[PDB]
């Protein structure tokens, strides 16, 4: 499944303080996979193309507001330090999606890459 094209989710986390829980995903050989559970985290995009999750800090003020959110061991491929660039990130999604996560699904089993692009609705 993961080895072949099939499921790939692309969602922009929503902006919330606390009261939300998220799960992380991992992929290994021998048909073995692992997941982790952690409270609410900053805002960015979840790359479930296989088992990756990217988190970005919208601002330090949010951390002071929800310091017990990402304090738990977060799973990120890279720190991705971003300063003024972070403001542009919100402007890019805020101007298009406004603030609604989305999921995707695609499979090469057919021949190329038929993909789906469902969006989150409030």
Alpha-carbon dihedral of residues 23, 116, 89, 80, nearest 10 degrees? 50
State how many domains the chain has. Answer: 1
Question: What is the domain range of residue 122?
Answer: 1-122
Return the residue matching tokens 């061991």: 73
Rounded Cα gap, residues 63 and 100, in angstroms: 21
Give the method of determination: NMR
Longest distance between any two alpha carbons in the chain, whole Å: 49
DSSP string, 12-79: E----SSS--EEEEEEETTTEEEEEEES---EEEEEETTT--EEE-S-HHHHHHSTTTTTS----S--
Count other Cβ atoms within 10 Å, centred on residue 84.
6
Token reading at 44: 């960015």
* CB burial string 68-80: b at 16+ within 10 A, e below: ebbeeebbbeeee
3-class secondary structure, 9: strand
Measured between alpha carbons, how far is residue 97 from residues 14, 34, 48, 55, 86 in Å? Answer: 11, 31, 19, 18, 16
Measured between alpha carbons, how far is residue 88 from residues 83, 84, 91, 117 in Å? Answer: 10, 7, 5, 23
């Amino acid at each position: 499944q993961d080895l072949q094209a099939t499921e790939a989710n692309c969602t922009v986390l929503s902006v919330q303080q606390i009261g939300e829980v998220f799960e992380c995903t991992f992929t290994c050989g021998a048909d073995c996979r692992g997941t982790s559970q952690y409270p609410c985290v900053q805002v960015y995009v979840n790359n479930s193309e296989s088992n990756s999750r990217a988190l970005l800090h919208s601002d330090e003020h949010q951390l002071l507001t929800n310091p017990k959110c990402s304090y738990i061991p977060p799973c990120k491929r890279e720190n991705q330090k971003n300063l003024e660039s972070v403001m542009n990130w919100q402007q890019y999604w805020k101007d298009e999606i406004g603030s609604q996560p989305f999921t995707c699904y695609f499979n090469q089993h057919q021949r190329p890459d038929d993909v789906l692009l469902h969006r989150t609705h409030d």
